[PDB]
């Protein structure tokens, strides 16, 4: 545990820690959460402007909450799908049957986020194992290879929306130093 | 009429309400389905926050309106 | 040294700078490249906002390092 992006925080702004520990290391920013969220608003606005069906189109979609800065400091998938998108990574749904059918070994993947509405699990591959962390979790839940296979299944059964990140994720020093652990 | 309440998680709650229904009552309806505390329920419509002491008609809210619920749902 | 710049659209540009180059001067380079004025431009380097009157040296920005170009913070 030498150079590891281990930030601590509490009281909303959970997304600030989720992204801060998404690609193994830090690179994002709190203010960026409102920027990437407004990206969808930017496109939706011009879209709803032309394809305006009602008056609410250029009203509710002109000022979409959370997209134009959140009140409490929480953002949904609106910032997750965009965060990876701007870096060149794709988000795959491993909980939805229409996509889950791909059946791709999760141990081969890079990182995935689980959503249960009331909580989200930030899971990412570290060294040769899988680590789950959060703002409400100081202890990285060491996920074994054989346990991960079951974990993913348990999440699906529970109703955890699994967002798998496909592509080449920029690993940090924590990946190299974790290779010497079991 | 029925409205669409977008919860911070990627869910749209379709609940039946009333024009003269108070925002606070709307929260109770959401609490009955999602279980989210009305007090922490930051109901925002088109950027404008819905005050508990106001009604749906106050913000010109009609049927199939896109509401947005804000709060620390992630927890950690 | 050629760092980088991450836009909010997913586009990245090979920004060339010097060790003693200031954030402000970098913003100029971006102004020409993109077009967005420096006052509108925001630069972040790993959960840290870069001040216009600060050199890249202190920031520790090593060779070939990305940067976050934020420009949307308006809300209502």
Swiss-Prot record, chain A:
There is a cross-link at residue 1 (Peptide (Met-Gly) (interchain with G-Cter in ubiquitin)). It is an enzyme of class 3 (hydrolase). Keywords: Hydrolase, Isopeptide bond, Lysosome, Membrane, Neurodegeneration, Nucleus, Phosphoprotein, Protease, Repeat, Spinocerebellar ataxia, Thiol protease, Transcription, Transcription regulation, Ubl conjugation, Ubl conjugation pathway. It is found in: Nucleus matrix; Nucleus; Lysosome membrane. It comes from the Eukaryota. Its EC number is 3.4.19.12. Residues 1-180 form the Josephin domain. GO terms for cellular component: cytoplasm; cytosol; lysosomal membrane; mitochondrial matrix; mitochondrial membrane; nuclear inclusion body; nuclear matrix; nucleolus. GO terms for molecular function: ATPase binding; cysteine-type deubiquitinase activity; identical protein binding; K48-linked deubiquitinase activity; K63-linked deubiquitinase activity; ubiquitin protein ligase binding. The UIM domains bind ubiquitin and interact with various E3 ubiquitin-protein ligase, such as STUB1/CHIP. They are essential to limit the length of ubiquitin chains. The poly-Gln domain is involved in the interaction with BECN1 and subsequent starvation-induced autophagy. This is Ataxin-3. It comes from Homo sapiens (Human). The gene is ATXN3. The chain holds residues 1 to 182 of 361 of the full protein.
């Amino acid at each position: 545990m030498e150079s590891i992006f281990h930030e601590k925080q509490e009281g909303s702004l959970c997304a600030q820690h989720c992204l801060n520990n998404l690609l193994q290391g830090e690179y994002f920013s709190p203010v960026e959460l409102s920027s990437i969220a407004h990206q969808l608003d930017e496109e939706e606005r011009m879209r709803m402007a032309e394809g305006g069906v009602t008056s609410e189109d250029y009203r509710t979609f002109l000022q979409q909450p959370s997209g134009n800065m959140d009140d409490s400091g929480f953002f949904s998938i609106q910032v997750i799908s965009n965060a990876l998108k701007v870096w060149g990574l794709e988000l795959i749904l491993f909980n939805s049957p229409e996509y889950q059918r791909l059946r791709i070994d999760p141990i081969n993947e890079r990182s995935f986020i689980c959503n249960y509405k009331e909580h989200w699990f930030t899971v990412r591959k570290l060294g040769k194992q899988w680590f789950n962390l959060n703002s409400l979790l100081t202890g990285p839940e060491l996920i074994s290879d054989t346990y991960l296979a079951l974990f993913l299944a348990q999440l699906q059964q529970e109703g955890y929306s699994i967002f798998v990140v496909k592509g080449d994720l920029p690993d940090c020093e924590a990946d190299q130093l974790l290779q010497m652990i079991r | 009429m029925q409205i669409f309440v977008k919860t911070l998680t990627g869910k749209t709650i379709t609940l039946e309400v009333e024009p003269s229904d108070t925002i606070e009552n709307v929260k109770a309806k959401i609490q009955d389905k999602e279980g989210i505390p009305p007090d922490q329920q930051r109901l925002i419509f088109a950027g404008k926050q819905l005050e508990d002491g106001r009604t749906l008609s106050d913000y010109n809210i009609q049927k199939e309106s896109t509401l947005h619920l804000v709060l620390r749902l992630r927890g950690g």
